[PDB]
């Protein structure tokens, strides 16, 4: 829940903006949180609205935007590749290692709900894990992975009386 509060605080701080321009750490945190919450429209608009001078003086924003571009193209291998290509002073890392976990859960849910059968290599690329790791991990949920054909088989996952009295009171006046 701290991620939502940090996002709100960063948005408010960028709105305060003594000069219209926020500090580059706040820009990076806001972009990382936008990527984390899978909100790509606001992330892209933040990228366009970041001044070019801030971009040139802060090369980290390029890495966060490369990860965002990978997310925009729905390129999960690219997402995992670009996430593990950058580091900073533990203000974007907590919200970017948490981005990887959210991306992995998203990929798992997408494969579960979209595929009745997916190749082991494709599933491993989706979850960003080694093939044998991905196949072994689906053990207690029963995904019926098969050898030789290398085909996985994803599995799909009061006050009512007051309301009714309100409805009748409305209808009868």
């Amino acid at each position: 829940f701290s991620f939502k509060k940090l996002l709100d605080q960063c948005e408010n701080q960028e709105l305060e903006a003594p000069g219209g321009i926020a500090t580059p750490p706040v820009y990076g945190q806001l972009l990382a949180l936008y990527l984390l919450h899978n909100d790509m429209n606001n992330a892209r608009y933040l990228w366009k609205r970041i001044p070019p001078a801030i971009k040139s003086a802060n090369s980290e924003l390029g890495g966060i935007w490369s990860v965002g571009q990978r997310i925009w193209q729905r390129d999960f291998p690219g997402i995992y590749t670009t996430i593990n290509a950058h580091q900073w002073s533990e203000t974007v890392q907590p919200i970017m290692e948490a981005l990887r976990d959210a991306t992995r859960r998203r990929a798992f849910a997408l494969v579960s709900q979209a595929y009745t059968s997916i190749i082991a290599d494709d599933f491993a690329a989706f979850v960003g894990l080694p093939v044998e790791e991905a196949v072994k991990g689906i053990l207690e949920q029963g995904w019926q992975a098969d050898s030789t054909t290398r085909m996985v088989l994803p599995r799909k996952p009061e006050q009512q009386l007051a309301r009714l009295t309100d409805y009748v009171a409305f209808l009868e006046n």
């Binding site: 007051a162 009295t165 009868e172 006046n173």
Partner: protein
């Protein structure tokens, strides 16, 4: 009654006659509750002696089930076929007390039954003795029990009766309170609507009478 007849035959008997009468009670069809005979001090005095197992056997037919006898077959006296059938009927009743849709697998495992025909024959037997009333769903492999008799209760099982009845009374009180509150709210809504309508009409009449000047 049938159990009351056996109690009158155990007023003074003790020893081997008591065990013979206990076996007759457990075998005679139609009697599926044994608490009145179990509470007798004469019967309870069997807890010490050679016939103690017999008393425990009665405690199996009043509070225990068939799996409780399978695990203690050596300790208990060798049951007759009729007594085993009665114990299976009581196990069906006990299962029906906690769930109203008993899977066939649970009945097969608990009653140590061989196949589906034998189990359903036993269930039909239990229905014909009026201790349970329900229907057999072969396709879904269920026994939907509509009614079942109340088995015997220990002195520690009366607390559950009090708990359930207290919860039911609290639910009834809450429902009545909600009904009264909803009646009050509906009446308030109706009176407020009528008051606002009459106030609007009065304002319109005042404006109309002012417009005539």
């Amino acid at each position: 009654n049938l159990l009351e007849q056996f109690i009158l035959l155990a007023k003074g008997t003790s020893g081997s006659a008591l065990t013979a009468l206990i076996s007759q009670v457990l075998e005679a069809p139609g009697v599926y509750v044994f608490g009145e005979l179990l509470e007798l001090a004469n019967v309870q005095e069997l807890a010490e002696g050679a016939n103690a197992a017999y008393l425990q056997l009665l405690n199996l037919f009043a509070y225990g089930t068939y799996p409780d006898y399978i695990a203690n077959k050596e300790s208990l006296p060798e049951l007759s076929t009729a007594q085993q059938n009665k114990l299976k009927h009581l196990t069906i009743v006990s299962l029906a007390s906690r769930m109203k849709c008993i899977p066939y697998s649970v009945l097969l495992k608990d009653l140590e039954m061989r196949n589906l025909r034998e189990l359903e024959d036993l269930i039909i037997e239990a229905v014909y003795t009026d201790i349970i009333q329900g229907k057999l769903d072969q396709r879904n492999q269920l026994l939907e029990v509509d009614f079942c008799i109340g088995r015997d209760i220990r002195k520690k099982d009366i607390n559950n009766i009090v708990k359930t009845l207290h919860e039911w009374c609290d639910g009834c009180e809450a429902v009545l309170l909600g009904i009264e509150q909803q009646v009050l709210r509906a009446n308030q809504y109706k009176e407020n609507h009528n008051r606002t309508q009459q106030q609007v009409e009065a304002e319109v009449t005042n404006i109309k009478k002012t417009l005539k000047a």
